[PDB]
Amino acid sequence: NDLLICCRQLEHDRATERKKEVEKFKRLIRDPETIKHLDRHSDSKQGKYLNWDAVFRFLQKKMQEISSLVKYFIKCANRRAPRLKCQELLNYIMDTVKDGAIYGADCSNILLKDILSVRKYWCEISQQQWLELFSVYFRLYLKPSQDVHRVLVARIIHAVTKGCCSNSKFLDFFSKAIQCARQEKSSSGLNHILAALTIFLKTLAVNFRIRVCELGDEILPTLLYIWTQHRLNDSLKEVIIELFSTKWRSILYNLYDLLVNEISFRNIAVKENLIELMADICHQVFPWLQIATQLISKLSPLLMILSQLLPQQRHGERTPYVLRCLTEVALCQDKRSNLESSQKSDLLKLWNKIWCITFRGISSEQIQAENFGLLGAIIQGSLVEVDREFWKLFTGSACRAVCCLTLALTTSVKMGIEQNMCEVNRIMKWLLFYQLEGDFPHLVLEKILVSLTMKNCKAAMNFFQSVPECEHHQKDKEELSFSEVEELFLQTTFDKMDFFSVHQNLKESLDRCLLGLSEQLLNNYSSEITNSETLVRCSRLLVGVLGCYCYMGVIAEEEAYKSELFQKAKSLMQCAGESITLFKFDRGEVESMEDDTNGNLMEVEDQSSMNLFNDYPGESQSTIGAINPLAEEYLAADIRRKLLMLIDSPTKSLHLHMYLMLLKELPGEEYPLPMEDVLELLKPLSNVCSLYRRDQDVCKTILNHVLHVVKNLGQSNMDSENTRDAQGQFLTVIGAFWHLTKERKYIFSVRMALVNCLKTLLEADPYSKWAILNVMGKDFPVNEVFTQFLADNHHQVRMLAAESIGDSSRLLKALPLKLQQTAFENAYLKAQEGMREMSHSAENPETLDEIYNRKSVLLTLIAVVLSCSPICEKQALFALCKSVKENGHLVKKVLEKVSETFGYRRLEDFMASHLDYLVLEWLFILLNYTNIEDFYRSC
Amino acid sequence: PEIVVELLMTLHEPANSSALCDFSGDLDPPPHFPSHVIKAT
């Protein structure tokens, strides 16, 4: 990288063609940068820095510059291992500034995409300057846009980079103006606009007008196919911002509905998607019952509109009896349809069943007779597959003989028949139907319902004997060629065990699962093409059954631990295979999932982790699980992903060393990993799983405290500089530290940690109310000395004062979160409740938002306690607040007037409090005169 | 007889006792958030 670059420079100092010199450099940079030339990384950095100046001198010339750029791109491609991200960004900025220009940009689009990929890969360098480049690119691609295809891709890449890293109003206005002046192609701009709208801090204050203008421009002129998704996303965002101007939004919704009705196989799927979008948006926005009835009364498009109106309303609500009876009459009329397009008919039947289930909207009349008649008429011709399940669901909803005979005849399907039997369950013929049907708790529930008769055990014994004969007959092929037969036999054995108790286990097969596991281990040891296929099939079958059920599942696991000889053999084989395979952010996860071998290894590791969790032979597996920590510690990207997946998955004795070493091992990789990737979420789950049993009376307490200090240092570095994604992890860590133990574990300044969490919440305001409520709930259950509650109340008051002390709307919004947090803390506490109530009543002057939310406050108080008890508590709190104000005349009168305004009363009904205040202050004829003026006969 | 078996019970042992949306959660914060806090309390 150094000697080759020096030779290339000495050869091409004349700048004649720079071809042979570049070829010699590309040929000789291999070994010189491989073994040693001079600090290979810095050598390549200096070589790139010198090549930049060489290209500048060569350009100081259009075709020659293009050839030099192509040669530099080829050299960078041959040098796929890059370094000096800052120098790369500087070179990219220089190329963008240099930009005839249209052809140059079209040629450099490849280098721009390569730089965008390099940024998405190594954004851990803390660039913090991609926003300026994205804005410059959007401004350059704004007037003529320099393109119609590459400009959209560049804008999308810039928006993705900005969203990954961390003004927009001008860009949105320019995009709206362009969409109104010309066509709306290149929907990448609309996607970037939607991403910027849903980026962060969406208040719909000024963006609402821009969104309305864009919607109007897209409704008037439009020529695009993918723009429909962006329009639907914008409509959903507007509906969510409106119902968590109004006339303009209603007009836009009506125009969109009219356009959808005018637009009205692939066309069927397109119409279904457009309906699922538009009807959902209309239900979220909205009155609509009349429009729905008119559209139903007003034939593929009509049937599609009817099916859309039915499922949308059924998922939305249970609207008035008028619309209910209209829909019932419509269904009774359409019951005699031609049954064409059975999918729409089944959807309409499911919607009618859901409406009949949610029929508690009108008075209980005799309208159910028509529904019962329609159900009977449908059951008279229900010889279908999906229609039978729809009729069964409708009958179950109506209930929540002829029907029993029909159910028995249908049972004599896998999921549909099971659902029908479960709905019917909510003699000799029943036993015969059960035997004909028989010839993850759903199987256990069906077995319990079948055995609830407490008789006919001979039929079950004969069925089990017939299944063992078929299993023994199919084992001849399952052991040789058939691979799914082993999984089927394992599932049958699990279902039989789900129904000491070793009698049935030894009776049924006593060998099927063990033989299947042995064959799978032998195939994995052979490791051929079909062998790996069967191994992947067996791994999927094993991952299918990973959980732990009730007592039935416990008995099944006991039988498994008893017959676990072959299970431990297969586990050792899988461990050997995983070791052999190891020996050989979102991008890393995608690269790990794109490999079939890596996916199979991950499935085997997940199965092993599930087995270890179920265990935490059978008893001998504890030693193997304990020895597995050495293999886990001994086990770049794929290895790290496997270690993370293993760490993400009594045992505390060995854990106090295994996880203690794993946490230190994870920090070394976390040195470069420390970029705020999605891995922070997986790390909190592992930390919570490891912290189940911590702070023990052993030497591992020092390692636990060291890990906690490392986590605290990481949280401090995040509070210094991070993103909003770390807020949830910080809140979870704070809650864990609060709920862990007493002051012995809270010696890490839990009060200061909560104060810092509240400060970060008031600063960023991402999901701040949830974090505040979690902190309040954690403080309330641990409060047992009455001093921590007062300290937390004072800290919350100080945080609210700091938040209170353009930006006026944001300040008022932040003050509402603090008021809600104080209200939640009051509803949680008992004495701090009255303390915070008096504090809010005193600060009511600047707390107009609290005076407005007093309605919901009183609603919550009446939901918690009775009305008379809340009134008495409020009177006691008002007396306490008046006493506090008197202790620290005019202020007391102002507080009393504020309390009377918050309530519904004049300056009266408080004779006891008035007499107490008089005996306190006067012991003053002014108070007596005021009382006489407020109410006569006061002497 | 099946009504007793169909009755919903508790979860399993600790191995199983433990067990857009973000846009709705952000839009809830603050009448909906105070209502949710009061319902949880």
Swiss-Prot record, chain B:
Tissue specificity as recorded in UniProt: Found in pancreas, kidney, skeletal muscle, liver, lung, placenta, brain, heart, spleen, thymus, testis, ovary, small intestine, colon and leukocytes.
Annotated localization: Nucleus; Cytoplasmic vesicle; Cytoplasm, Cytoskeleton, Microtubule organizing center, Centrosome; Peroxisome matrix
Interaction with ABL1 as annotated region, ranges: 28-34
PTM entry text: Phosphorylated by NUAK1/ARK5. During the late stages of DNA damage response, dephosphorylated following deacetylation by SIRT7, leading to ATM deactivation. Acetylated in vitro by KAT5/TIP60. Deacetylated by SIRT7 during the late stages of DNA damage response, promoting ATM dephosphorylation and subsequent deactivation.
Family: Belongs to the PI3/PI4-kinase family. ATM subfamily.
Described purpose of this protein according to its UniProt entry: Serine/threonine protein kinase which activates checkpoint signaling upon double strand breaks (DSBs), apoptosis and genotoxic stresses such as ionizing ultraviolet A light (UVA), thereby acting as a DNA damage sensor. Recognizes the substrate consensus sequence [ST]-Q. Phosphorylates 'Ser-139' of histone variant H2AX at double strand breaks (DSBs), thereby regulating DNA damage response mechanism.
Involvement in disorder: Ataxia telangiectasia: A rare recessive disorder characterized by progressive cerebellar ataxia, dilation of the blood vessels in the conjunctiva and eyeballs, immunodeficiency, growth retardation and sexual immaturity. Patients have a strong predisposition to cancer; about 30% of patients develop tumors, particularly lymphomas and leukemias. Cells from affected individuals are highly sensitive to damage by ionizing radiation and resistant to inhibition of DNA synthesis following irradiation.
Name of the protein described by the UniProt record: Serine-protein kinase ATM
Gene: ATM
Included range, full protein: 1341 to 1389 of 3056
